[PDB]
């Protein structure tokens, strides 16, 4: 409350690190249906069904330009991407494993790093 903080946590080297994070995620096997934004003209249903679209290259843009005010919210958009993948891949489809493993690997490297 007002002149009562808890101790001052370091984010100085938050950035840095979702960068990171991010080129992990980028440079992974997996990635190819993440790396750009859905081609809402080619891909029937995508514009209407979802209603946030997310993909890592609009992800590096944002942090890149400061557009993320803390690492929950970079960390909010990682996961809009996989969220929005099993709206609309069944599980059982490349796509559908992709992101699984990709939210898998995400998750893992996101704890290591932070908590």
């Known amino acids: 409350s007002m002149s009562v903080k808890k101790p ?20 992974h096997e997996d990635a190819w249906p993440f790396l750009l934004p859905v081609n809402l003209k080619l891909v029937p249903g ?9 993909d890592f290259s609009t992800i590096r843009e944002k942090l890149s330009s400061g557009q993320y ?9 990682v996961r809009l991407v996989f969220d929005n993948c099993e709206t ?16 898998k690997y995400f998750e893992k490297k996101w704890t290591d790093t932070f908590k």
């Open 8 to 27: 001052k946590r370091d984010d100085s080297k938050d950035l840095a690190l979702c960068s990171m994070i991010l080129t992990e995620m980028e440079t």
């Open 46 to 54: 995508y514009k209407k069904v979802i209603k946030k679209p997310m």
């Open 88 to 103: 609309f891949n069944e599980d059982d489809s490349d796509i559908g494993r992709a992101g699984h493993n990709m939210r």
């Open 69 to 77: 005010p803390n690492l929950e919210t970079f960390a909010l958009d």
